[PDB]
Amino acid sequence: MKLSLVISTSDFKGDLRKGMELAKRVGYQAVEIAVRDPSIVDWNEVKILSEELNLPICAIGTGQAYLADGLSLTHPNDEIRKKAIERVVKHTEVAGMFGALVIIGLVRGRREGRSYEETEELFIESMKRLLELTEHAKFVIEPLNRYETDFINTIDDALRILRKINSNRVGILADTFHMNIEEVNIPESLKRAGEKLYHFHVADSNRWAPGCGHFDFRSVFNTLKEIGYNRYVSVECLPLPGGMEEAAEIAFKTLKELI
Amino acid sequence: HMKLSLVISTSDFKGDLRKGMELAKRVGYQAVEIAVRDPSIVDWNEVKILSEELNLPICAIGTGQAYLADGLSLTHPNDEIRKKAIERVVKHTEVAGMFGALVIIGLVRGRREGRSYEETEELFIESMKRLLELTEHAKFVIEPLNRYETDFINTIDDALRILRKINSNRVGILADTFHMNIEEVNIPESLKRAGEKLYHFHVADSNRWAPGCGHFDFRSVFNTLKEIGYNRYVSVECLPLPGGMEEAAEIAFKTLKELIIK
């Protein structure tokens, strides 16, 4: 089981450097980044930087491609959906340089007045298209709470869709903040996810640094040990309390104590 | 002496109301809670008759749809709309007066809308004081809501700050477990800070399903409620899950009843 830190960067080199150096200084084993459009960033420097600090990049976020450019893998407009798929393909090329996972969060899109079934099938089609367009890329579907989406809110929802995609290149990314709302019994949900649990995000009930809310992290980590989770636990929380740096330190401290 | 109430969903009405109230009575609830967009289009004398026939008081009236449907806000940047919001709420108080019910100030307070928290809060305090000058018996409860529903008054402390500025015992707090599960650091401690200001309470599990179908820690909450002497209403406001409206209300009642009696 490894700890990583999600670092926020502008739409960049400055924020990345600072973030990675902070992660190294605190003790994180890896870092996780999030970029809207990767084609404008020079990843060769990124790799150099990474190699320099001996700090791997575990995953690449794609949420902004949706929040900023409105790209969706279930967009009703086919030309837009095609562009969404092509954008994610570029995310995988970046991920391939570091052997990282590609996060499929809000980029999957919402029902937008359509049935759950039509949305799901369109999503499955796009995912299959991505699996065709890329050879080794690995994707992780992140169930999000009801306020952020009406498509894939729970781990069980994700599992059912994974069975329809039928590929070990697609797994699940569970997030404690979102599970706090959507999951009935978190430990049991994780056990059902089992080996399909590819990545993990941590933040407290208020989305602050772990240890600053009331989320039960102990039970979570006991379950993760029980199922033999040997992948990444990435800190993805608001810069609270006291800012980005303090939050990272606090989160690392409480999580380390439990691992 | 805590009492149990059920929030009943009503279309924007008699049909839904009667079925909801009869359900509450059959399950054992001591009162119901309703929500109406505009009270002016409802014959409330028929409602009172129904309440009397079923011996089911109406402990609180929601006003959230006044915002969600009519866009009325007590902190709206357009003073014209702000006045209308106040006028709409006054009508809710007139209805509340017929039942001795509390008026809930939820989403009707509005959002920051790109403004500072200080200005929004000042506008709100001004609207609440106006509401108090306009009413002689109405009692209001401010309900903190999670970040996704609003950026104005998310925690019990936010409300407490506002209450001290309003300085009126006719305004109190309505805390909701589903919302607290997100916004409050430590729920028991939050409730102790509210103390006597806690006028009404909403209950729903972490997933907003009937209490007992999530992972929210209700035991600790009720221990604190006892410790603080809360003796008013605990109203169930959850999604009709699992199994529907009736099943959810039944499960909710059973969960709460056992917590109380013990």
Curated annotation (Swiss-Prot), chain A:
Gene3D superfamilies hit by this protein: Divalent-metal-dependent TIM barrel enzymes
Activity relative to temperature: Optimum temperature is about 80 degrees Celsius with L-ribulose as substrate. Is hyperthermostable, with an apparent melting temperature (Tm) of 102.4 degrees Celsius.
Catalytically driven reaction(s): 5-dehydro-L-gluconate = keto-D-tagaturonate; L-ribulose = L-xylulose; D-ribulose = D-xylulose; keto-D-tagatose = keto-D-sorbose
Cofactor note: Binds 1 divalent metal cation per subunit. Mn(2+) is the most efficient metal cofactor, but can also use other divalent metal cations such as Ni(2+), Mg(2+), and, to a lesser extent, Co(2+) and Zn(2+), but not Ca(2+), Cu(2+), and Fe(2+).
InterPro entries membership: Hyi_epimerase/isomerase (IPR053560), Sugar_Epim/Isomerase (IPR050417), Xyl_isomerase-like_sf (IPR036237), Xyl_isomerase-like_TIM-brl (IPR013022)
Keyword terms of this UniProt record: Carbohydrate metabolism, Isomerase, Manganese, Metal-binding
GO BP annotations listed: inositol metabolic process
Enzyme class, broadest EC rank: isomerase
Origin: domain of life: Bacteria
Isomerase in keyword set: yes
Record field: pH dependence: Optimum pH is 6.5-7.0 with L-ribulose as substrate.
Pathway this chain belongs to: Polyol metabolism; myo-inositol metabolism
Biotechnology: High thermostability and very broad substrate specificity of this enzyme make it a potential candidate for the production of rare sugars for the food and pharmaceutical industries.
Subunit structure: Homodimer.
PANTHER family linked: 3-DEHYDRO-D-GULOSIDE 4-EPIMERASE-RELATED, ISOMERASE
Function: Catalyzes the reversible epimerization between 5-keto-L-gluconate (5-dehydro-L-gluconate) and D-tagaturonate, and thus probably functions in a myo-inositol degradation pathway together with IolG, IolM and IolN. Is not active on the enantiomer 5-keto-D-gluconate. Was also shown to be a nonphosphorylated sugar isomerase with broad substrate specificity in vitro. Is able to catalyze the reversible C3-epimerization of L-ribulose to L-xylulose, D-ribulose to D-xylulose, D-psicose to D-fructose, and D-tagatose to D-sorbose, with a substrate preference for ketopentoses rather than ketohexoses.
Family per record: Belongs to the hyi family.
Protein name: 5-keto-L-gluconate epimerase
